[PDB]
Ligand binder design. Structure first.
Ligand SMILES: CC(=O)N[C@@H]1[C@@H](O)[C@H](O)[C@@H](CO)O[C@H]1O
Ligand SMILES: *[C@@H]1O[C@H](CO)[C@@H](O)[C@H](O)[C@H]1NC(C)=O
Ligand SMILES: *[C@@H]1O[C@H](CO)[C@@H](O)[C@H](O)[C@H]1NC(C)=O
Ligand SMILES: *[C@@H]1O[C@H](CO)[C@@H](O)[C@H](O)[C@H]1NC(C)=O
Ligand SMILES: *[C@@H]1O[C@H](CO)[C@@H](O)[C@H](O)[C@H]1NC(C)=O
Lengths: 49, 98, 196, 99
């Protein structure tokens, strides 16, 4: 039980770090996608000055 | 900027405070009730090509007018709303008119 | 893993799984939102006209290919092949759901470790359909299809509008229409060559 | 569906707008159809149907090398855009929380 607790803490920390880095790069992807929607509206759906 | 202050041609906007946020009442212009016409890229007159200054050439079938690109309002094509630049050979699709 | 002994100790640490699953679900619905906002900017699907003469301009490499099973454009085909494809959550009765194209089959392995990749709400087929609708609106309607009803306009006229929008008198576009078409075609070909 | 197996919903060849996205372009909805000719608000079977997403009315823009469309009227639309600005500012007494 102690060893499984240690392994659970390790894997949970690994998953939590994975989820946080996914959140950070998902905010990055969301910024890029907002930029892409802006470019669709102003370059594809219009002409941007 | 297209689709930045609401879908359509944005006219104005009004802020309204709300709990932990703002609501923008995007007053925008939207076109509707369209009509189809026959168009040309330039008008050939006196051997020279006239291009519209601000609008676009349309025809209802027998008469040719120049209208604003976002709201239908026929006007008689004259030299005040058109400029002459070029010759009546390069324009692929020029149309005889007056 | 497949163990209740670990799960009993696992639930002791609280609603951490609830937070993690909620964050991942928010990420997934945010991906759906991203695709919808980028591509689904219109709610009318536009059919490409059968006759594709556009004043000399050539959109063969960007318009959909009818012969292709997926109706993807040649440029889109190049982009599809060049990128090392991951899985898309498809199913072909293979046991492992979809058949990854000899690139990243290890997703199947990633399936075993209590995890899966979820298919996008818009399949690549209907994503390409949205892209084709956008392209047809741009070619036929111009910018008008994004601010209300779609208003058809010949492509050289839209080129004249785009010329006027950058401070260049649109008459120039008609004085060198064939030159502009040739330069556009050559630039698209060079784009294909550079990508390949 | 390409996402998996759907039970309790009946597949419909007709396509409506997405209500509950299932996956791979397939969406579910609770629909009121008179196929069974039974009660108005409760059909004889389960009213959960599944359909391919309708991306929209398949408009056919009447393209021609000499045809244009000009709008004759307009609507003054007042849409609503809601922007979060400031979340509730929070203070945590570290010592009081932990200890
Ligand atoms: C002047 C005129 O008739 N314009 C159009 C024409 O292309 C067609 O009859 C139909 C296509 O939607 O709508 C109208
Ligand atoms: C068009 O206009 C030109 C000069 O503006 C004239 O020479 C020609 O006869 C007209 N008709 C045709 C069919 O080109
Ligand atoms: C086109 O508009 C003019 C404007 O006065 C009108 O006289 C003419 O009858 C119209 N033609 C058609 C076919 O509606
Ligand atoms: C315009 O009509 C068709 C439709 O695209 C086109 O293929 C043809 O080349 C054009 N004809 C003329 C006379 O401009
Ligand atoms: C334009 O549309 C409005 C609808 O709000 C209508 O009341 C008005 O009569 C229309 N104008 C014309 C000229 O038909």
């Amino acid at each position: 039980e102690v060893q499984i607790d240690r392994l659970i803490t390790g894997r949970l920390q690994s998953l939590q770090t994975y989820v946080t880095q996914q959140l950070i790069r998902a905010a990055e992807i969301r910024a890029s996608a907002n930029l892409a929607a802006t470019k669709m509206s102003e370059c594809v759906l219009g002409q941007s000055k | 900027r297209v689709d930045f202050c609401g879908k359509g041609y944005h006219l104005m906007s009004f802020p309204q405070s709300a709990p932990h946020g703002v609501v923008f009442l995007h007053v925008t212009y939207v076109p509707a009730q369209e009509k189809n016409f026959t168009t040309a890229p330039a008008i050939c007159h006196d051997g020279k090509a006239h291009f519209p200054r601000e609008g676009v050439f349309v025809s209802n079938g027998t008469h040719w007018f120049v209208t604003q690109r976002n709201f239908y309002e026929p006007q008689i094509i004259t030299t005040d709303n058109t400029f002459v630049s070029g010759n009546c050979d390069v324009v692929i699709g020029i149309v005889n008119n007056t | 893993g497949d163990s209740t002994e670990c799960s009993n100790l696992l639930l002791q640490y609280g609603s951490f799984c609830t937070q993690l699953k909620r964050a991942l679900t928010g990420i997934a619905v945010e991906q759906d939102k991203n695709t919808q906002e980028v591509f689904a900017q219109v709610k009318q699907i536009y059919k490409t006209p059968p006759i594709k003469y556009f004043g000399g301009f050539n959109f063969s490499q960007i318009l959909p290919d009818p012969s292709k099973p997926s109706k993807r454009s040649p440029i889109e085909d190049l982009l599809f092949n060049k990128v090392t494809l991951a899985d898309a959550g498809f199913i072909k009765q293979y046991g492992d759901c979809l058949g990854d194209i000899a690139a990243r089959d290890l997703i199947c392995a990633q399936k075993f470790k209590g995890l899966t990749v979820l298919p996008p709400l818009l399949t690549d087929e209907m994503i390409a359909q949205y892209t084709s609708a956008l392209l047809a609106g741009t070619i036929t309607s111009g910018w008008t299809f994004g601010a209300g009803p779609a208003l058809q306009i010949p492509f050289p006229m839209q080129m004249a509008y785009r010329f006027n929008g950058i401070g260049v008198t649109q008459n120039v576009l008609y004085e060198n229409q064939k030159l502009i078409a040739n330069q556009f075609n050559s630039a698209i070909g060079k784009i294909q060559d550079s990508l390949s | 569906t390409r996402a998996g197996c759907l039970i309790g919903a009946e597949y419909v060849n007709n396509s409506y707008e997405c209500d509950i996205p299932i996956g791979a372009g397939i969406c579910a909805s609770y629909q009121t159809q008179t196929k069974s000719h039974g009660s108005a608000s409760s059909v004889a079977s389960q009213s959960i149907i599944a359909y391919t997403m309708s991306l929209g009315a398949e408009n056919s823009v009447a393209y021609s090398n000499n045809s244009i469309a000009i709008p004759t009227n307009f609507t003054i639309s007042v849409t609503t855009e809601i922007l979060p600005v400031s979340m509730t500012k929070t203070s945590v007494d570290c010592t009081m929380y932990i200890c």
